[PDB]
């Protein structure tokens, strides 16, 4: 049985002046070491206050797009094999009011080498409960090309390993992930 579901993030599409959004959940395939026995399928379980809970089988895929329209929408990604689904999983809640709640006070990024950037930050004395953080990075003034990594909330620094395009300035968006939902990021631009 898989011990833990995969860590996951998202990207959105749609008119930014409307609440409805096509949300694409994103994860990496669970490695041999990560699950012990082979993961055969992934399941996306949804929950909203007025539609209840429903699950979508996505097979061997590593993304799932759904239309988000409700005041709050929680998603959980489960890893499945013949013995069952992962009991403990990561969760993300989409809530537009939560997207206006900050937690990152200061943010720095140092290009230690052409393929390694150290991110450092401080957090504000919270009220909402921080689950963890997610760093997004992409080329400044570009549409896609986004990469992400989950960061434990117990650290104040994180090393990002990437085959960065050195001539392009990169934009680093550190997102706080609260129990109540994904929060307001802190963003800095910098060369690598």
């Amino acid at each position: 049985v898989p011990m833990r579901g995969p860590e996951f993030w998202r990207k959105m599409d749609g008119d930014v002046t409307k609440k409805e959004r096509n949300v694409t959940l994103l994860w990496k395939p669970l490695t041999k070491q990560d699950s012990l026995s082979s993961v055969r399928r992934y399941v996306v379980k949804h929950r909203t206050a007025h539609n209840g809970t429903w699950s979508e089988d996505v097979g061997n895929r590593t993304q799932l797009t759904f239309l988000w329209t409700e005041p709050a929408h929680t998603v959980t990604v489960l890893a499945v094999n013949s013995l069952g689904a992962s009991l403990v999983n990561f969760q993300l809640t989409f809530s537009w009011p939560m997207s206006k709640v900050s937690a990152v006070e200061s943010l720095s990024a140092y290009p230690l080498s052409s393929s390694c950037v150290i991110l450092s930050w401080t957090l504000s004395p919270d009220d909402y409960s921080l689950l963890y953080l997610v760093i997004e990075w992409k080329i400044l003034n570009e549409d896609d090309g986004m990469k992400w990594l989950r960061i434990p909330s117990n650290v104040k620094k994180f090393y990002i390993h990437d085959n960065f395009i050195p001539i392009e300035k990169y934009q680093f968006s550190l997102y706080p992930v609260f129990m109540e939902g994904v929060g307001k990021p802190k963003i800095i631009n910098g060369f690598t």
Partner: nanobody
Amino acid sequence: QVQLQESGGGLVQPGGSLRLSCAASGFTLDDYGIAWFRQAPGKEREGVSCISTSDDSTYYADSVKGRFTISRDTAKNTVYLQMNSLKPEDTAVYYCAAERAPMCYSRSYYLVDYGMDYWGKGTQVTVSS
């Protein structure tokens, strides 16, 4: 004292153009992003256009894309909204509003009235024959 002030509104015939200005004071474009909203008769204040606080990325309401263009002059602490090929349904009071950075940063952001920290008094735009 934080202040946002719109100007440039007026009466235009359908097909015409107007350019709105929003002068800000008491804060800079470094700490807040300034975006445009509009409130048509009997409706709520809806997002029209924004520009990122991190880069020059811009986003628009579906009904105004291509016709409208937001721009800024950071040295003057002023934002603009160029409004072309105006339609009667564009009639509304237009507001500029500030939101603590970062804002308008990607498609994971929502330009919504409740997220704004400061508002201008608004400028009437009337598109009529």
